[PDB]
Design a protein around this ligand. Structure first.
Ligand SMILES: Nc1ncnc2c1ncn2[C@@H]1O[C@H](COP(=O)(O)OP(=O)(O)O)[C@@H](O)[C@H]1O
Length: 89
């Protein structure tokens, strides 16, 4: 697993419907990343040449509200089942 800087516009976020993000943690992470940068890269799954992200909601929102183009990611080659497992009620 190689850490890659992926643009924010390429990570599909299917769980944005459940975006109960506390702006306090978001702003704390914004300040910390603006200080020392992102330390824990988010988890991204590649399926059929498309990137999906289910964790790292606060970090993603912080990168968005900080005006940063890319974010560090640890990409895992995934299948249709691990993509379907995350999309199961
Ligand atoms: N530069 C950073 N400053 C502060 N926290 C960071 C940084 N990089 C990664 N993190 C991680 O962000 C997490 C805190 O946000 P959290 O809400 O848990 O993340 P998520 O976005 O997955 O919900 C911690 O697990 C922390 O290790």
């Amino acid at each position: 697993p190689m850490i890659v800087e992926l643009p924010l516009e390429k990570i599909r976020r299917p769980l944005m419907r459940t975006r109960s993000n506390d702006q306090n943690k978001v702003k704390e992470l914004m300040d910390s990343i603006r200080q020392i940068g992102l330390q824990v890269p988010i988890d991204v799954i590649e399926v059929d040449g498309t990137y999906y992200g289910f964790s790292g909601c606060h970090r993603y929102e912080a990168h968005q509200k900080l005006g940063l183009p890319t974010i560090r990611c640890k990409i895992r080659k995934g299948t249709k089942e691990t993509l379907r497992h995350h999309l199961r009620l």
